[PDB]
Amino acid sequence: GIQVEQSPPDLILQEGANSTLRCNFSDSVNNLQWFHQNGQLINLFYIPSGTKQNGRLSATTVATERYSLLYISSSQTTDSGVYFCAVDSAGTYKYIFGTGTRLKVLANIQNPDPAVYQLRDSKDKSVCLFTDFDSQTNVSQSKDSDVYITDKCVLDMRSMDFKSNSAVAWSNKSDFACANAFNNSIIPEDTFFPSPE
Amino acid sequence: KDLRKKSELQRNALSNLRQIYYYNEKAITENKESDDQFLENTLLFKGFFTGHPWYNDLLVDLGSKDATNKYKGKKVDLYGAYYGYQCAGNKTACMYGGVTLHDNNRLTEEKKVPINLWIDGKQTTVPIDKVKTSKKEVTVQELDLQARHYLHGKFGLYNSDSFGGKVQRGLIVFHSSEGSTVSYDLFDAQGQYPDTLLRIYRDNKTINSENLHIDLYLYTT
Amino acid sequence: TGVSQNPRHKITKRGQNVTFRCDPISEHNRLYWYRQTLGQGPEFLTYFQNEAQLEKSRLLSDRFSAERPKGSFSTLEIQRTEQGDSAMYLCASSLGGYEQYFGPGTRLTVTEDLKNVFPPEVAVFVPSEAEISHTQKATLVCLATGFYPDHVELSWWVNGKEVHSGVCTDPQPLKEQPALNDSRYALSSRLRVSATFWQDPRNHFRCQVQFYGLSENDEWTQDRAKPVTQIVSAEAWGRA
Ligand SMILES: [Zn+2]
């Protein structure tokens, strides 16, 4: 029947860069839509034919050549997520969505200072915080079953015009040190390892 | 009985029969006059719908021009099932029949039509208030809509087999005092959408309410 | 968008029947129902145009029934729910073949037993002196642990006011026991302020975790407290 193919399936963009997202479809279309998902589908464009602009976003669909392009100009960290293309196709109705383009926007870190700090509970309980590392750094899962490691996120201190990446590690064990916490990750040689207290 | 089977229905017919007879709002009004329209076989009721997000007008299909001439501009009562999908090829809903002349057709007390039910041959009592009319001359549509509403709420007539619908074959009989019969097969659905399913009411068949009873034959086989 | 959906979250024991409701944009004659499983895109279930059901997908279980009961609104019934039914059920509305406007969705979690439902335990981890002396910035770590299902909403509150600047929560929670099918979840979040702001003892910092649990109509026969929709918080005050 009606087939939708989106490319690239996964996209890594540096903060401020531009990229073209592709949507290929098998038959002639009456409805074509581009969406952005955060679990709420944000309507970006309704474009079965022609060219449209919506700020930093632009789209174009060649109905005859059976393809649609989505342009993202000056990418932001908020642009991260999944981009969907959906068609209806001019027998039996079915509105088909593509697999999507998962976009990861890497924040521009002006002065990286990768460090691993031990943070104690507000009320013996502790947490290992890997922070100030460059956006390209990949945080891996632990080899151990009792050790929990989170994925990286970027926070924005708007008042200071400062951005920083962080990942968290913790264990129920007492043998858990922050120096061995992110051993399964390939971290910069200059990662700061301060001593507790 | 050469009754049509529930299994023989088209892909969306069962769900659309469920909508028409149990869920969908009906066009029920008294003292209405059709507006000027050059269209043959149809009556236009401009501004029929008050405070409806989809419709303003009601389009009534009667089939012939002889039926249209009898009711055009005339004072009329309306009782039938309306639909918007595939209507007029905007802000207009469609209906087949359900038209009766207003003047001198009202009763002092509402006639409760008795229902005689048979599930695989077994007789079962139906509450008397199920099928009721305020008209001397009533459309078959007015009676059928009320009868099929009770059948779905009680037996799941138009529910899937997985959703508890056990009735596979059915027959609705409108028995007139003079010994006259109007009988519709409960599963002899034309098409899958209301534009074709409701087409049975186009003839605008009208019958007498005085000493009229309903005979129903339901089968789980 | 203007399209409403209720409930926003739902927990059911496997084998129980569940019903969702969608209220579309009034002027829109078309109504769509979609299913979205983890990592995948929305999958078409069925669609209505006015009072009529136009099409239901060929690969749609006999356990599903979609109706338009009293005009505009639509209901989606799933009978005898199974683990595979755990998904985001999306509703969309349009004026014919034009632009589809989506609702916020219904998060459905099908559990083996309602005893597997646990609210989160929330803890706040105070900034380290080493971070303060090295960056002149202070990071607070919030740890929400042992919750099931992953129906959570994390927020930071500074002096009774919700903050959005200097904040990042994990993209998704992590499974505590990834081997178990009804494993409990853990979620972390960070709040970064200046060392100065943290050193002021007049400043209050609260991590709020909104949990979506069991309804009032749910039966509970356990020694512990009924895990209903609740807010679990952890707090810290500033120090020199
Ligand atoms: Zn009889």
- The CATH number of residue B89's host domain is 2.40.50.110
Read off the amino acid at residue B205: K
Domain enclosing residue B85, as ranges: 23-102
Tokens matching residue A164: 């920083």
The domain boundary, picked from B56, B75, B102, lies at B102
Chain center to CA of B52: 22
d(CA A58, CA A55): 7
Query: Ligand 1: distance of its center to the CA of B81 in Å?
Result: 26
Tokens matching residue B10: 């088209």
Chain center to CA of C28: 27
> C98 φ, ψ to 5°?
-80, -175
d(CA C53, CA C65): 11
Q: Same domain, yes or no, for B6 and B71?
A: no
Q: SS3 of C54, please?
A: strand
Query: Which H or E run includes A179?
Result: helix A178-181
- Compare CB distances from B85 to C52, C62, C70 and report the shortest one's residue: C52
d(CA A118, CA C232): 24
d(CA A187, CA A183): 8
Closest CA to B20 of B214, B164, B193: B193
Cβ(A99)–Cβ(C41) below 8 Å: yes
Q: Same domain, yes or no, for B7 and B37?
A: no
Q: Same domain, yes or no, for B77 and B116?
A: no
Positive or negative torsion for Cα B82, B85, B87, B90: positive
Task: List all residues 6 or more positions away from A173 whose beta carbon is below 8 Å from its beta carbon.
Answer: A146, A147
Chain center to CA of B62: 14
Answer left, alpha or beta for residue B104, where phi above 0 means left and psi between -120 and 50 means alpha: left
Q: Which residues of B touch C69 (CB under 8 A)?
A: 23
Q: SS3 of B69, please?
A: helix
Q: How does A77-97 read in b/e, with b if 16+ C-beta sit within 10 Å?
A: bebbbbbbbbbbbeeeebbbb
Query: Ligand 1: distance of its center to the CA of B214 in Å?
Result: 7
Task: List all residues 6 or more positions away from B33 whose beta carbon is below 8 Å from its beta carbon.
Answer: B73, B74, B75, B76
| Alpha helices (H) along chain C | 129-135, 195-199
d(CA C115, CA C232): 19
Cis bond before residue A8 (omega within 30° of 0): yes
The domain boundary, picked from B76, B102, B128, lies at B102
Counting the structural domains of chain B, the total is: 2
Q: Which domains does chain C have, with CATH numbers?
A: 1-112 (2.60.40.10), 113-240 (2.60.40.10)
Question: Is B102 known to sit in a ligand binding site?
Answer: no
Listed resolution, Å: 2.4
Read off the amino acid at residue B115: I
Contact partners for chain A, using 3 or more CB pairs closer than 8 A, are C
Contact partners for chain C, using 3 or more CB pairs closer than 8 A, are A, B
Positive or negative torsion for Cα B32, B37, B38, B40: negative
Read off the amino acid at residue B55: Y
The DSSP 8-state label assigned to residue C118 in this structure reads B
Could you give the maximum distance between any two Cα atoms of chain A, in Å? 71
d(CA C213, CA B140): 51
Distance from CA of A97 to the nearest CA of C (A): 6
d(CA C55, CA A2): 15
Closest CA to B111 of B86, B137, B85, B93: B137
Query: Ligand 1: distance of its center to the CA of B175 in Å?
Result: 5
Chain center to CA of B28: 11
Half-sphere exposure of B189 (CA within 13 A, CB side): 27
Q: What angle do CA B197, B202, B204 make, to 5 degrees?
A: 130
Cβ(A160)–Cβ(A148) below 8 Å: no
Closest CA to A132 of C30, C18, C192, C163: C192
Q: Is C95 on the interface with B (CB under 8 A)?
A: no
The verdict on a CB contact (< 8 Å) between A155 and C168 is yes
Experimental method: X-ray
Q: Is B90 on the interface with C (CB under 8 A)?
A: no
Cis bond before residue C149 (omega within 30° of 0): yes
Q: Is B103 on the interface with C (CB under 8 A)?
A: no
Q: Is A141 exposed, middle or buried (CB count within 10 Å of its CB: 0-12, 13-18, 19+)?
A: middle
Read off the amino acid at residue B65: K
> B144 φ, ψ to 5°?
-60, -40
Query: Ligand 1: distance of its center to the CA of B38 in Å?
Result: 42
Tell me which of C36, C59, C139, C169 to substitute to probe the interface with A (most A C-beta atoms closer than 10 Å): C139
Q: Same domain, yes or no, for B14 and B122?
A: yes
d(CA C181, CA A101): 29
Closest CA to A105 of A68, A74, A141, A139: A74
d(CA C229, CA C211): 5
Q: Same domain, yes or no, for B159 and B93?
A: no
Q: What angle do CA A193, A187, A139 make, to 5 degrees?
A: 110
Q: Same domain, yes or no, for B113 and B198?
A: yes
Q: Which domains does chain A have, with CATH numbers?
A: 1-107 (2.60.40.10), 108-192 (2.60.40.10)
Q: Same domain, yes or no, for B70 and B115?
A: no
Q: Is C69 on the interface with B (CB under 8 A)?
A: yes
Question: Is B213 known to sit in a ligand binding site?
Answer: yes
Instruction: Please state, in angstroms and as integers, the Cα–Cα distance from residue A30 to each residue in A46, B3, C134, following that order.
Output: 10, 41, 59
The verdict on a CB contact (< 8 Å) between C67 and B19 is yes
Which residues in chain B belong to E strands, given as ranges?
26-33, 42-45, 57-61, 75-83, 92-96, 99-101, 106-112, 115-119, 122-125, 132-135, 137-139, 169-175, 181-185, 206-208, 213-219
Q: Which residues of C touch B161 (CB under 8 A)?
A: 62
How crowded is residue A117: how many other Cβ atoms within 10 Å of its Cβ? 27
Tokens matching residue B97: 């029949």
The verdict on a CB contact (< 8 Å) between C97 and A148 is no
Tokens matching residue A154: 């970027």
Closest CA to C131 of A20, A178, B135: A178
Residue in chain B lying closest to C17 (CA): B163
How crowded is residue A17: how many other Cβ atoms within 10 Å of its Cβ? 14
The DSSP 8-state label assigned to residue A116 in this structure reads E
Q: Which residues of A touch C166 (CB under 8 A)?
A: 155-158
Q: What angle do CA A33, A39, A40 make, to 5 degrees?
A: 50
d(CA B189, CA B156): 17
Q: Same domain, yes or no, for B91 and B117?
A: no
Q: Is B129 exposed, middle or buried (CB count within 10 Å of its CB: 0-12, 13-18, 19+)?
A: exposed
Q: Same domain, yes or no, for B123 and B74?
A: no
Query: Which H or E run includes C232?
Result: strand C230-237
Q: Same domain, yes or no, for B10 and B59?
A: no
Chain center to CA of C64: 23
Residue in chain C lying closest to A172 (CA): C176
d(CA A25, CA A31): 12
Tokens matching residue A157: 């201190």
Closest CA to A32 of A101, A100, A96, A99: A96
The DSSP 8-state label assigned to residue B8 in this structure reads G
Residues in chain B preceding a C-to-N separation beyond 2.5 angstroms (breaks) = 89
Tell me which of C25, C50, C65 to substitute to probe the interface with B (most B C-beta atoms closer than 10 Å): C50
- The CATH number of residue B113's host domain is 3.10.20.120
Q: What angle do CA B67, B68, B70 make, to 5 degrees?
A: 65
Cis bond before residue B127 (omega within 30° of 0): no
The domain boundary, picked from B102, B130, B155, lies at B102
Q: Same domain, yes or no, for B62 and B73?
A: yes
The DSSP 8-state label assigned to residue C195 in this structure reads H
Q: Same domain, yes or no, for B213 and B136?
A: yes
Task: List all residues 6 or more positions away from B4 whose beta carbon is below 8 Å from its beta carbon.
Answer: B169, B185, B187, B188, B189
Q: How does B157-187 read in b/e, with b if 16+ C-beta sit within 10 Å?
A: bbbbeebebbbbbbbbebbeeeeeeeebebb
Contact partners for chain B, using 3 or more CB pairs closer than 8 A, are C
- Compare CB distances from C65 to B54, B83, B163 and report the shortest one's residue: B163
